[PDB]
Design a binder for this molecule. Structure first.
Ligand SMILES: [Ca+2]
Ligand SMILES: [Ca+2]
Ligand SMILES: [Ca+2]
Ligand SMILES: [Ca+2]
Lengths: 287, 96, 219, 218, 96, 219, 103, 103
């Protein structure tokens, strides 16, 4: 199949006459089985039938289940006629260290460049010029630690010199909330690609289980810090309400203006295909 | 005064679809009839009811929603004609 | 709305409330019998300004006040329509009711989506909410005065009844209550004709003497 | 489940979908007569896995597919009772419904007090709200292939009916549609038995010859 | 004669979208201008060009397509009010 | 009584019994769906000699033979009227029935005179005697053939039904029974149209090939 | 708070049977479910709703009617065993549980 | 563990009434006390005695007999309220309590 069916709303699923019946309160849609490729369930209110699960076993389509946090939890594993993603995980186990270091360095360069560009949009030329100098000074293996050095400059520019990531405040909790949403989206995209999220691009720290998605979501991180900088005076609830509008807001991809879901999808697909093909092209995202 | 009303809006998001359903139900509750998708009309008694209806429509317009309002005479409203559907090679069969 | 019988010299007009007192028991009983049998008998003739004679279906005759049934399908239906109009006259209240009904419909719709069967519905309206509430007039605890007042209130709801007539209904009411009934009848514009054997003191009425002479009386 | 009549040597079992062909018109018409008269006539019998006779109330006999109404008083009663049970399983949701119904009753009660005529009311119930909303199964059916699918859905929903029987209903559906109906029956696990005057090619069916001998096919 | 035309059709299928693009391009080639989505208008010289245009529109209508047609005067066309989705000072009187 | 659909080249006339066999399952199922939905769909058009299109209320559609209810208020009423006419055609039998009813009325009248209360009555008629007897058609023990025969017998009693149509009803009946049904339909003059997927051997019928060609067939 | 309710009353007279049917219908309308004869339960949201329900039950109790009300936790409600002369499975410690053919 | 036990069964036949009397006498002999009709309870020392009591109750259940067993804490047992269409005093919040003449 081709189309990837994702259910973000409450609904029921049935199977009739080689036709998947999706029923929601607004309308009912019927989709052919041969057209569907991957099936993902975003919420916990979705209802499905074991008969449709058996038809999906005959159709080989991958079934993805998610929790209330939207982070993917479990996936359907058939005993025979397994999906091609399980065959694609072996290439992820075969990922070379040079390709991982190249993609990681490109990701850090994109994040730092987005931070310096955002500081230029905030009209701080000295801090943005310093972060840009650290961006041009970034190297493999990260001996300079210019990312951790650009961090303090970015946060100190945004929220002031007194603010820091270690302190407990509604700004830090808001940053962890936005990073949790972006980690949920990018983690869902990596789960759609089938690659194991436990294997990270960063070779130093394996502690986090999301390390792959956490490394892929870095170039989009400053977009959260912008809204957190504008709404910083508001309470954490209002900051959550403002951060919840990022899904509805549209952003500019290099090719065309798109929604965040499609942009993260194309970026993740280019990242996985580039890792399996050993660096054909590196997706670049700029604010 | 015969009020012809066209309604469009991006339907992609779920919130946009819900807003479209709400606005359509509001149009039906106000006396408007849907001749086709995005196509509606309602017979307003006079100019005052027309102005109040314009204000209400501006108040109930969903985000990103776009409404086109045109005044037509009752006889011209009955004159409304709804059509529901030069090639060298005509193919009856599989289109290849 | 003029009524005429052989005993009267000229047809008498009935406008708003009218109290007709017949001092002769024979003419009174014969007139009441002519009121119940009116379709069969040609003696008593009631006609409107068009001189057209009204049918017995258009005539409303009432003797027992507490025995009459005020709750009917047409009366309750038109009453529910009147309540729906009262709720429609206020935009804010109608908006709030629409909001609550929208919430309930959302809940029931979610419960329907949770079911395995494919379910469809339409809407929950205000008339259906009133019919589900069971709005009706309560005559159980009502006094005779409140019963006749409710009858005068629902006479506007009755479409087919041209004129309401009461037989010996003024004996239960006090003079002040009769004044309230007449003063309310003047506002309701309905045509009510009361028939009493004895004259009531303090109210304008038409008196028929044993001599068969009809005279207006202020008291 | 198994069905037995005097013509068969041994009772044949009906599991999931089953196609029964009767090559004798007299035995077919007499068999349908025994199906409609099953309560009156003791000739035709049905023995489940428990080997217990079942009443005609548990047997669902459907001849005309389009003429069979999906919405009935008993079906709507069981559906409304089911939704009422689902709403009763959640105390918080039912509490919110009671609050909203209390608000609407307060508004309508205030409007009733504003009127000059005395008004008496009782209350509003969740069942009256469901019946007022008109909750019912979907009545939209484009073709008999979908209508028979709705009949299979309502049959699988009804616990009291142990068997569903169709009389000459396979003549409307194409061979591929018959395959989809058999696959949907095997997926739904319900017991469906078909009665056809002539055999159908390409599908497994039990052929009853004019000699009264029963033989398997495909 | 001012010809107001509303156009709609299910857009889900790719063939339906292609037919919608073809019909829209045909409307633009015939002199119609799109005020908003599904909203178009064209100025017809007389009743003759109006009838011929009605026949052509019926011939070019795509499958499942639906077109609403209304005849409107210039004064009614200038009175067309399009609202695309709260005043502090309300003035009843001369607007100064 | 001509019926026409898009597949046919010319509208085909239906006189007395007519057996229409559709060899294509798609066109057959679509035609039956157009028979149930006939009021909604404009594809299938049935018109009389006046070219006036008959309403779905005038059309009688029958699929399940044993599931259809032959006993209705109008059918039983008109049947009782027919029995009253049959009893009225014979003067002697009507005279005897009048005598017996006179005797029973005399007995009941004597019993009424013996009572202390004043009692009045009118008459005991023949239609009231038939309604008290509960005359009705028995479909309980009837075979499918006798059921369809009774349907052809009561189709004359139905006033509003213009044409009777049966869906796949010829599969139950033997060739001889079909000959009896057609031969009886020629005498009853009613218009019956049968729809079968497979052709019946030995009877005149109209065959629609998978090529969508309609041809008359003697066998 | 899980509210367990038992209901008994002399059923001999016709008026008593009618009162029993009325009280049972009132219990069903209030959200109570009948597990078996005379056995019912309802889930009360909090203590206030429990007190109001107690007052309503005292008001709707029929003449000669007797109602036993007990308060129970979800863990005790899942531990409820019903034995019909066959006992409930929830009290059983059996490792394998078959909803289906026991074979 | 506080064991609450309800007992019901068709009483119409004489054999059924005799079986009901036998089962009730068996419940009294095992330490159960009857609070009201069909209502009984017994205090079990531990879970083992509770399981053995469950097996014994299943063995002694009469034909057509139905017994409901529930496990309850002492705090829930003291909160048990019984209303006779007279109610239990423990559920009442009344300030003054009179065991004696109520005056
Ligand atoms: Ca009610
Ligand atoms: Ca409704
Ligand atoms: Ca008589
Ligand atoms: Ca009788």
């Amino acid at each position: 199949g081709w189309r990837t069916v994702v259910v973000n709303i409450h609904s029921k699923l049935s199977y009739k006459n080689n036709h998947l019946i999706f029923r929601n309160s607004y309308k009912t849609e019927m989709i052919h089985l041969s057209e569907i490729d991957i099936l993902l369930l975003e919420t916990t209110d979705i209802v499905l039938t074991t008969m449709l699960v058996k038809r999906l076993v005959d159709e080989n389509i991958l079934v993805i289940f998610c929790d209330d946090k939207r982070l993917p939890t479990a996936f359907l594993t058939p005993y025979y006629a397994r999906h091609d993603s399980s065959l694609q995980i072996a290439r992820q186990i075969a990922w070379k260290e040079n390709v991982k270091c190249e993609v990681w360095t490109a990701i850090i360069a994109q994040k730092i460049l987005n931070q310096s560009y955002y500081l230029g949009e905030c009209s701080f030329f000295e801090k943005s010029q310093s972060i840009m100098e650290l961006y041009h000074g970034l190297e493999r293996f990260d001996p300079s630690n210019r990312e951790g050095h650009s961090a303090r400059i970015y946060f100190n520019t945004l929220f002031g010199n007194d603010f820091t990531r270690e302190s407990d405040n509604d700004i830090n909790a808001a940053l962890d909330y936005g990073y949790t949403l972006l980690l949920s989206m990018f983690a869902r995209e990596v789960v759609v690609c089938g690659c194991m999220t436990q294997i990270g691009l960063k070779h130093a720290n394996q502690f986090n289980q999301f390390n792959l998605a956490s490394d892929i979501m870095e170039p989009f991180r400053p977009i959260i810090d912008r809204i957190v900088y504008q709404n910083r005076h508001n309470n954490f609830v209002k900051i959550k309400k403002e951060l919840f509008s990022i899904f509805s807001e549209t952003y500019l991809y290099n090719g065309k203006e798109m929604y965040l879901s499609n942009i993260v999808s194309d970026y993740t697909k280019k990242v996985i295909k580039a890792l399996n093909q050993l660096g054909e092209e590196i997706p670049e995202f700029r604010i | 005064m015969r009020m012809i009303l066209m309604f469009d809006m991006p339907t992609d998001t779920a919130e946009e679809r819900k807003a479209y359903r709400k606005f359509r139900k509001f149009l039906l509750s106000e006396g408007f009839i849907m001749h086709q998708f995005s196509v509606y009309s309602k017979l307003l008694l006079n100019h005052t009811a027309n102005t109040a209806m314009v204000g209400r429509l501006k108040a109930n317009n969903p985000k990103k929603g776009n409404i086109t309002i045109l005044t037509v005479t009752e006889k011209q409203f009955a004159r409304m004609i709804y059509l529901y559907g030069e090639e060298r090679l005509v193919f009856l069969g599989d289109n290849y | 709305m003029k009524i005429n019988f052989s005993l009267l010299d000229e047809p008498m007009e009935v406008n708003l409330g009218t109290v007709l007192v017949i001092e002769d028991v024979s003419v009174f009983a014969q007139l009441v019998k002519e009121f119940y049998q009116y379709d069969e008998q040609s003696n008593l003739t009631i006609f409107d300004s068009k001189i057209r004679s009204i049918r017995s279906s258009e005539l409303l005759l009432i003797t027992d006040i507490l025995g009459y049934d005020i709750n009917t399908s047409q009366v309750l239906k038109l009453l529910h329509t009147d309540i729906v109009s009262q709720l429609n006259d206020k935009p804010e209240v109608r908006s709030e009711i629409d909001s609550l009904v929208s919430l309930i419909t959302d809940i029931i719709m979610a419960e329907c989506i949770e079911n395995e069967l494919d379910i469809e519905y339409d809407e929950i309206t205000l008339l259906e909410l009133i019919k589900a509430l069971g709005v009706r007039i309560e005559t159980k605890s009502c006094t005779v005065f409140e019963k006749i007042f409710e009858i005068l209130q629902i006479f506007k709801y009755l479409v087919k009844k041209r004129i309401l007539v009461f037989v010996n209904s003024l004996s239960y009411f006090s003079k002040d209550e009769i004044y309230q009934i007449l003063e309310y009848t003047k506002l309701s514009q309905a045509d009510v004709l009361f028939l009493e054997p004895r004259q009531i003191e303090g109210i304008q009425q038409f008196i028929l003497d044993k001599d068969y002479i009809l005279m207006p009386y202020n008291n």
